[PDB]
Amino acid sequence: VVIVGKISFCPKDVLGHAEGTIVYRGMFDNRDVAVKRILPECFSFADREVQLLRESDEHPNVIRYFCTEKDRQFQYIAIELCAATLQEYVEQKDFAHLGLEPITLLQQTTSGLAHLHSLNIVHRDLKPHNILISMPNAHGKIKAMISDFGLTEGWIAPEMLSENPTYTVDIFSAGCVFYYVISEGSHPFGKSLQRQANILLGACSLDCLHPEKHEDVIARELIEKMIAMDPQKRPSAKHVLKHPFFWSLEKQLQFFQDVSDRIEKESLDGPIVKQLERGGRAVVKMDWRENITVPLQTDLRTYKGGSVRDLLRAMRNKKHHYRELPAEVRETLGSLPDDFVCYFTSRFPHLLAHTYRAMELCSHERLFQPYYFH
Amino acid sequence: VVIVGKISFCPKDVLGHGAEGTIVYRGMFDNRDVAVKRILPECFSFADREVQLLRESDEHPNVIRYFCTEKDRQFQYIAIELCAATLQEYVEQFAHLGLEPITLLQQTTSGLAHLHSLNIVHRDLKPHNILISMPNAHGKIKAMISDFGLTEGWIAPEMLSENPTYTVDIFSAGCVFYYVISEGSHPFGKSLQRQANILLGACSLDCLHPEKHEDVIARELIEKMIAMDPQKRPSAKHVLKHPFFWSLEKQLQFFQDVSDRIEKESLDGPIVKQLERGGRAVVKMDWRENITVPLQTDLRRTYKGGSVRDLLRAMRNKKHHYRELPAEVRETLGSLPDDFVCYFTSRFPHLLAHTYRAMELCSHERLFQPYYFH
Ligand SMILES: CCOC(=O)Nc1cccc2c(Oc3ncccc3-c3ccnc(N[C@H]4CCCNC4)n3)c(C)ccc12
Ligand SMILES: CCOC(=O)Nc1cccc2c(Oc3ncccc3-c3ccnc(N[C@H]4CCCNC4)n3)c(C)ccc12
């Protein structure tokens, strides 16, 4: 049992290991902490590390930093003790029973990154090993926190290999982490020792994302942009956070309703509706009236099966008049909003992604403020 | 400058005092600015309980951040986040900080709800221990509660009449709400008079005008928070749902959802009867005569001037069809959502409060979950 000022730890309890650094399970001011021990050859950089932690850890998805002490031969840095790294969480068995929502972990990670970027801090080394997963709080909630910021490979943006990086390098890394999480351990650029060369070669695939499943279509749309070889094509963190990938089912339904309201009095020859119907036959599966349940078919009469506009209108109509619908129709649709919107997105996997892209024409309008990034 | 382990301070920099002869200095901890409370040996037992509460409670953004405690031969020291002001200072001396009072109160109440969710009762909530943070890197200032679980004028009457329940804090908070929005008054009077008036149940909310929307709404809530009967006071989570805290956009969304809900309601049903009970006063005898002529014109027709239900339907109609309204009509209303809703609440100060009470009948319905506490 080693005591160094306010920091203590039993060197028996080792949590991990670069440059002779060791991380221990420990204690600070009667808090559980992880304690990183730094060798004298690194003290200058540690003081840089510690300064960054102080300006940054007033965001819930940035790791909380408590204290640093220094004896004759070492410097110790104490941070919040966590349950796991994201790498452990994705790869180790049993964490699956924590039942964490992968999208929420990713939202949290990206909120922490956005915070860092708002402070003119570039992470430079984001990867699952330094995304930490908290101990559960009093209400059983577990969160992701970023660490090891501002300081083998496989997560490095290709332009950083090809002297002061910009924020888009972190967006590339985050894109790979996103895929890693929702695919439960794959990586767009392949197997561990292969990834960084494939990055340099632009050799990726997102094959775990199915082309006709709504959730996968939406995830792909976002991830392909985040890992683009051209950094100027990558969205900012705040921009990522606005993507439909992160929308609740209620917000997705609300988007469909607003879109439908917006184009109710729009000319069928106007730019908006034409944009919406471009490639629409594929979106509605040729005739959407033939790819809905019989009870809904019956309850549906000026609607064209070949029109995306009309599908949206039908959706808004049944939502708006839900209470007065027959019991059989309410049953086939499911309850509002969650089951209702899945009735449609499960049957038309391209509808939300298609409609989101088409309605960028209106992204500057106050109404659509919640949906797009300005 | 005095040094005690990780905590340092210059004894000149005094921030305040306290019971038992405690002193609070401006100091430093691990290169962070902190307030440093110095405690005497004749209190160390209470301090260790203080510190323990701080350790379990300070994860929440609206609970004071606690950093460290040190002890020498003579004293004990507690370091917390250094703040800009107490709410007492803020209210009584800052206005160019441009802080929103409702937002400060919302933050104060979120902090309290956190403590209550941990089975902690504050017992001594008052403006002096609500702290106002220094501006962060993005200029944001927040309220944080302190001095929890440890003359007067803020004590609930049943506490001076064993182990207090959470409702005593709601009484204290109700008084604080009125103090902030009134810029220094108290429902039970002047400083030396308050606690006797509390015992006697003698309060008034005279700063709240009976024909101003914002005050009607504030009164509705505050009267309940400071009820003499503790069982009549809402919980902190319940407080946080009140219209007092709603954005203008949310206020308008409530009106729209209500109008949608009652569109196919019979006038024989309880919802519409509840909405029309006492409605003459809400619509000022005839609402058609209390709106601007451009709007009078455009509502001709089939709207009943004596009907709350119809006024709400009117508001919903013009909102939904806003884009397609004459410019002179879009002009008198103002833009969606903020100016539009104010057009109506400014003219009908009782509409939201009335409609909110009447529609409690539907508070269990999924649609109205945003608006009521379950
Ligand atoms: C400018 C930013 O600088 C930093 O953030 N510096 C750091 C200081 C101290 C620990 C760090 C750190 O922690 C760890 N580093 C290596 C191995 C494990 C942990 C760690 C941290 C917190 N909790 C835990 N818990 C273990 C429990 C057992 C299962 N695995 C997680 N581990 C990581 C990563 C990354 C950075 C750390
Ligand atoms: C279980 C909870 O126990 C606690 O929270 N214990 C506390 C420890 C240390 C300071 C405390 C504390 O701080 C102060 N107590 C008296 C006077 C000033 C401050 C204080 C604290 C932080 N910042 C500031 N800033 C000053 C700057 C000058 C203008 N006034 C505010 N003051 C208050 C209240 C209340 C409680 C405090």
Side-chain angles (χ1 to χ4, degrees), chain A residues 1-11 13-18 20-38 40 42-43 45-54 56-71 74-92 95-96 98-161 164-273 275-277 279-300 303-312 314-363 365-368 370-373, chain B residues 2-9 11 13-19 21-41 43-72 75-95 97-160 163-276 278-279 281-284 286-298 303-327 329-330 332-356 358-368 370-373:
Chain A
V1 188
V2 174
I3 295 178
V4 186
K6 260 282 173 176
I7 294 170
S8 62
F9 65 98
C10 199
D13 314 327
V14 182
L15 304 179
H17 306 68
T21 59
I22 297 168
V23 185
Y24 309 81
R25 194 201 186 293
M27 293 291 291
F28 160 77
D29 192 34
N30 303 126
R31 304 193 186 245
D32 291 322
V33 291
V35 183
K36 178 153 92 174
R37 184 175 85 173
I38 298 95
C42 293
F43 281 7
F45 296 53
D47 290 326
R48 172 53 173 171
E49 174 179 1
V50 169
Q51 187 198 344
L52 283 171
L53 282 168
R54 293 188 213 107
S56 318
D57 79 348
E58 67 308 287
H59 189 283
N61 310 118
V62 173
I63 186 71
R64 177 157 181 187
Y65 159 72
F66 289 109
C67 196
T68 175
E69 304 264 28
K70 193 182 296 199
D71 64 16
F74 297 96
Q75 182 174 348
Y76 301 85
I77 302 175
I79 61 163
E80 173 181 349
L81 183 62
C82 297
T85 68
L86 179 64
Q87 174 166 3
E88 290 170 333
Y89 170 74
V90 168
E91 291 175 4
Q92 259 69 321
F95 286 115
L98 290 177
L100 265 279
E101 240 303 307
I103 306 296
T104 301
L105 290 180
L106 296 176
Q107 195 279 336
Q108 288 170 351
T109 299
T110 305
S111 303
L113 190 62
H115 177 72
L116 289 188
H117 290 170
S118 76
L119 298 175
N120 309 325
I121 295 175
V122 172
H123 191 306
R124 307 161 115 185
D125 193 34
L126 182 69
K127 63 175 75 142
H129 169 78
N130 51 45
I131 299 169
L132 293 165
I133 307 295
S134 74
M135 296 297 290
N137 68 10
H139 301 280
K141 301 307 183 188
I142 286 164
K143 63 175 175 166
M145 302 178 279
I146 57 184
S147 73
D148 227 10
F149 48 87
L151 308 163
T152 195
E153 295 159 353
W155 306 88
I156 296 164
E159 69 272 14
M160 203 144 63
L161 301 162
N164 288 326
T166 177
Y167 311 92
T168 42
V169 304
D170 294 338
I171 298 297
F172 177 95
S173 309
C176 295
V177 174
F178 277 30
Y179 185 76
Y180 177 84
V181 172
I182 59 178
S183 83
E184 304 186 343
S186 298
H187 185 288
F189 294 92
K191 304 296 190 201
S192 169
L193 288 167
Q194 170 184 58
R195 290 156 184 177
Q196 202 56 65
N198 276 342
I199 287 166
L200 291 175
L201 295 167
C204 66
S205 62
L206 301 174
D207 290 324
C208 302
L209 298 183
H210 190 275
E212 310 291 344
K213 174 171 169 187
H214 164 79
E215 293 72 17
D216 289 9
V217 171
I218 289 293
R220 180 183 283 274
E221 206 280 337
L222 172 53
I223 291 168
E224 289 179 333
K225 293 186 176 188
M226 295 176 71
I227 69 175
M229 294 290 299
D230 183 350
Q232 285 174 356
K233 301 292 173 56
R234 299 178 204 146
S236 72
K238 285 191 159 73
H239 195 165
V240 169
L241 287 167
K242 281 286 183 185
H243 198 273
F245 180 68
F246 294 114
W247 300 356
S248 63
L249 298 176
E250 174 172 10
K251 182 173 186 172
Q252 289 170 50
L253 181 57
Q254 186 69 53
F255 178 72
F256 284 139
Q257 184 184 283
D258 293 338
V259 168
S260 183
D261 283 342
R262 180 57 177 77
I263 68 184
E264 190 58 30
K265 296 265 199 173
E266 217 66 2
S267 174
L268 301 191
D269 299 287
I272 290 168
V273 171
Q275 201 83 101
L276 194 66
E277 300 293 0
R281 248 154 37 204
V283 174
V284 298
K285 287 175 168 176
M286 315 292 94
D287 180 344
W288 54 262
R289 304 189 68 143
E290 296 289 312
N291 292 263
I292 54 168
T293 65
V294 185
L296 187 63
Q297 292 183 359
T298 310
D299 205 69
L300 294 163
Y303 293 140
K304 311 174 292 298
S307 170
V308 173
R309 177 169 179 281
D310 286 352
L311 175 47
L312 290 181
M315 288 172 49
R316 128 97 199 177
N317 183 249
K318 299 295 146 189
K319 175 181 188 296
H320 190 245
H321 295 101
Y322 193 81
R323 296 186 49 80
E324 297 94 51
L325 293 178
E328 305 77 47
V329 184
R330 273 182 286 115
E331 184 169 348
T332 205
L333 286 172
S335 54
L336 283 161
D338 282 16
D339 289 340
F340 184 103
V341 72
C342 290
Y343 177 105
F344 295 102
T345 58
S346 73
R347 291 177 169 75
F348 306 96
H350 293 286
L351 187 57
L352 177 56
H354 171 91
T355 299
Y356 187 65
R357 175 91 71 171
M359 292 301 286
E360 269 185 331
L361 303 184
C362 300
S363 59
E365 295 172 12
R366 166 58 178 91
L367 173 59
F368 291 97
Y371 302 117
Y372 299 93
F373 173 70
Chain B
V2 179
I3 275 83
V4 185
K6 265 280 157 172
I7 297 170
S8 74
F9 64 97
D13 310 283
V14 177
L15 295 182
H17 295 79
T22 54
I23 322 170
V24 179
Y25 310 74
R26 189 199 199 298
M28 296 291 291
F29 163 79
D30 195 31
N31 300 125
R32 295 189 203 250
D33 290 312
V34 288
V36 183
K37 174 135 96 178
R38 190 177 80 174
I39 306 119
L40 291 157
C43 284
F44 286 7
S45 296
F46 293 177
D48 291 336
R49 173 52 165 170
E50 180 181 345
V51 167
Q52 175 171 24
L53 288 159
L54 287 166
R55 285 198 206 91
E56 311 164 8
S57 322
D58 79 351
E59 263 278 274
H60 191 278
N62 305 121
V63 172
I64 192 67
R65 191 159 172 190
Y66 158 69
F67 284 107
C68 196
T69 176
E70 296 284 15
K71 190 174 289 186
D72 63 16
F75 315 100
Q76 188 171 339
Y77 302 88
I78 303 179
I80 59 164
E81 178 172 351
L82 179 65
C83 295
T86 71
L87 183 69
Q88 178 168 2
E89 292 170 324
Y90 170 90
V91 168
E92 289 179 1
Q93 310 157 17
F94 287 99
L97 288 179
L99 310 190
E100 206 65 44
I102 304 296
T103 301
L104 290 179
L105 295 172
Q106 194 280 337
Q107 294 167 354
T108 301
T109 299
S110 311
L112 192 58
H114 184 72
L115 295 181
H116 289 176
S117 78
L118 303 172
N119 311 316
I120 297 163
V121 179
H122 187 307
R123 304 183 56 148
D124 195 36
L125 184 70
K126 57 178 57 175
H128 167 67
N129 50 46
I130 303 169
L131 291 165
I132 308 299
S133 75
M134 297 292 288
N136 63 14
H138 291 92
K140 293 305 184 180
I141 290 173
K142 64 177 178 165
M144 298 172 291
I145 58 190
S146 72
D147 224 10
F148 47 89
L150 303 176
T151 67
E152 45 209 351
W154 306 86
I155 297 164
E158 70 275 11
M159 203 137 73
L160 342 103
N163 294 343
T165 67
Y166 72 90
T167 47
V168 308
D169 294 337
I170 300 300
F171 177 97
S172 300
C175 291
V176 170
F177 280 28
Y178 183 78
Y179 173 84
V180 173
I181 67 182
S182 82
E183 305 191 340
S185 304
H186 187 287
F188 293 91
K190 299 300 182 175
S191 170
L192 295 172
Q193 162 185 62
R194 287 159 188 175
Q195 201 64 62
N197 277 340
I198 288 171
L199 278 189
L200 294 170
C203 59
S204 67
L205 303 178
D206 286 330
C207 299
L208 297 179
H209 196 266
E211 303 306 325
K212 187 188 174 191
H213 167 74
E214 293 82 4
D215 295 1
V216 172
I217 291 286
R219 182 183 286 271
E220 207 276 344
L221 174 59
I222 290 168
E223 290 186 326
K224 297 185 174 189
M225 291 175 74
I226 68 174
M228 297 293 296
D229 180 358
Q231 286 174 304
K232 291 294 178 63
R233 303 179 198 140
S235 72
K237 281 171 154 47
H238 193 167
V239 170
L240 283 165
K241 288 285 187 177
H242 195 277
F244 181 66
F245 291 113
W246 299 354
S247 68
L248 304 171
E249 177 183 348
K250 186 174 183 180
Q251 287 174 45
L252 182 60
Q253 186 70 49
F254 177 69
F255 284 138
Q256 184 188 298
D257 291 342
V258 167
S259 181
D260 281 344
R261 174 64 181 73
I262 68 181
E263 182 52 32
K264 304 301 185 168
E265 283 287 325
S266 149
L267 317 184
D268 289 310
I271 300 171
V272 175
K273 268 148 57 190
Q274 195 78 246
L275 193 64
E276 299 300 353
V282 179
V283 302
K284 300 174 165 174
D286 189 340
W287 54 264
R288 289 172 304 150
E289 312 281 27
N290 289 279
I291 54 169
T292 66
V293 177
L295 188 52
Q296 303 191 10
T297 302
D298 201 77
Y303 282 136
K304 298 164 286 293
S307 157
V308 170
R309 172 171 189 270
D310 268 22
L311 167 53
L312 291 168
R313 287 165 75 213
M315 294 170 60
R316 185 224 122 87
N317 179 261
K318 302 298 141 187
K319 180 184 178 300
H320 181 270
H321 292 95
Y322 192 78
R323 308 184 50 84
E324 303 120 42
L325 292 171
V329 169
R330 284 184 296 98
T332 184
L333 291 165
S335 44
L336 293 167
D338 289 11
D339 293 318
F340 181 102
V341 70
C342 284
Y343 177 102
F344 293 99
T345 59
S346 64
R347 295 180 166 78
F348 303 105
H350 292 284
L351 183 61
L352 182 59
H354 176 86
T355 296
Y356 188 64
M359 295 296 295
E360 220 162 27
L361 273 163
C362 299
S363 63
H364 295 283
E365 301 179 1
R366 170 56 176 90
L367 170 60
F368 290 96
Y371 310 111
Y372 295 95
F373 176 63

